[PDB]
Amino acid sequence: LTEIEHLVQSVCKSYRETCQLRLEDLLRQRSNIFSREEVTGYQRKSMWEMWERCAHHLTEAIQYVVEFAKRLSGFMELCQNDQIVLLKAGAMEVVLVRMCRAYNADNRTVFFEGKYGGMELFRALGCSELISSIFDFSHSLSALHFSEDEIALYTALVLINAHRPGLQEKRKVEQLQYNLELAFHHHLHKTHRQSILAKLPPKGKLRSLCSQHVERLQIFQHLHPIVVQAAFPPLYKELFS
Numbered sequence: 001l002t003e004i005e006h007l008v009q010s011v012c013k014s015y016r017e018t019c020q021l022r023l024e025d026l027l028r029q030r031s032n033i034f035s036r037e038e039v040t041g042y043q044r045k046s047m048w049e050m051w052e053r054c055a056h057h058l059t060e061a062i063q064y065v066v067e068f069a070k071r072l073s074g075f076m077e078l079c080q081n082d083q084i085v086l087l088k089a090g091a092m093e094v095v096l097v098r099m100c101r102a103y104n105a106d107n108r109t110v111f112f113e114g115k116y117g118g119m120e121l122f123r124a125l126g127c128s129e130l131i132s133s134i135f136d137f138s139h140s141l142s143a144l145h146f147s148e149d150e151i152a153l154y155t156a157l158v159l160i161n162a163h164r165p166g167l168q169e170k171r172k173v174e175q176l177q178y179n180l181e182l183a184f185h186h187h188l189h190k191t192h193r194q195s196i197l198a199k200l201p202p203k204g205k206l207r208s209l210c211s212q213h214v215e216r217l218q219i220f221q222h223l224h225p226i227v228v229q230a231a232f233p234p235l236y237k238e239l240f241s
């Protein structure tokens with residue numbers, strides 16, 4: 001009956017509709033691991049082919065997060081400048097959080113192109129430190145057994161942050177943020193999951209991880225430009241031109 005219970009339902013629905021793979025499918029595929037031969041095949045690929053593959057997967061992941069944001073109550077009513085400020089700053093942070101679902105803490109593997117593989121699958125990219133950081137981050141969230149609704153509500157808060165520099169209608173973003181904060185806290189209380197609050201990553205950790213990741217993608221894009229499937233001209237302009 002409350003606006004808050006409806007907000008939880010709407011955020012979770014927006015999330016279910018914008019999540020590429022179902023949790024059940026990711027969990028059943030846990031036993032489907034790349035063989036020693038398949039790993040070698042990925043390791044032998046050119047860094048530039050691995051870059052193209054990864055850039056396609058990441059672009060697609062970002063577009064689903066943009067669709068997720070568009071479905072958040074009041075996001076569409078924000079001015080274009082603020083929608084772009086929030087997505088530029090937060091869309092990749094949401095992508096990085098969403099990765100924990102495809103991460104298996106038991107063998108330190110991630111679901112990539114149909115099977116589970118370790119960080120050694122990405123050797124040709126020559127990004128070992130960055131990839132270890134992404135794996136470590138996914139591990140910290142996966143150890144919490146972060147539920148589907150916890151991911152939906154937490155990633156809505158990653159996006160709707162009134163502290164992002166450059167916002168023009170801060171008060172409008174704050175209104176949306178307070179309601180989502182209440183929705184998250186109300187949901188954790190009901191499910192007896194408030195204990196994860198002290199275990200979540202410090203905000204600065206996600207920001208720094210995302211800045212390092214985006215900086216690396218920008219270096220690859222400068223050296224070897226990809227043909228990007230662009231759906232959002234104002235957002236594309238901010239990241240690529």
Ligand SMILES: C[C@@]1(C(=O)O)CC=C(c2nn(C(=O)c3c(Cl)cccc3C(F)(F)F)c3cccc(F)c23)CC1
Pocket residue numbers: 055056058059060062063066087088089091092214215217218221228229230231232233235236237239240
């Ligand atoms: C959604 C999109 C469009 O369809 O118009 C525009 C922006 C994208 C994006 N890319 N991106 C990347 O990091 C990225 C990606 Cl996802 C792939 C290749 C290159 C890059 C980049 F920007 F670094 F050059 C973002 C980071 C934060 C917010 C972002 F929105 C992005 C992807 C496509």
